[PDB]
């Protein structure tokens, strides 16, 4: 298998939080119309939804 992350084909709603416990920066992403969030690489989020990433940083900050 079942799609995860950006491969679910859902619009990102908001970043719930960030973590780098795996070696690289990841974001816990909430998608529109789903209560199932999943971890996506920051490197992918930066490109695919920059404004969602920027909103997360700006609120903090």
């Amino acid at each position: 298998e079942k799609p995860r992350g950006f491969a679910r084909g859902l619009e990102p709603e908001r970043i719930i939080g960030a973590t780098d416990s795996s070696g690289e920066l990841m974001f816990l992403m909430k998608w529109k119309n789903s209560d199932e969030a999943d971890l996506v690489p920051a490197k992918e989020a930066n490109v695919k939804c920059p404004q969602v990433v920027i909103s997360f940083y700006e609120e903090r900050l």
């Binding site: 719930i16 939080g17 973590t19 816990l28």
Partner: peptide
């Protein structure tokens, strides 16, 4: 398994 929150 730690997450920094929005915020």
């Amino acid at each position: 398994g730690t997450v920094a929150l929005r915020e």
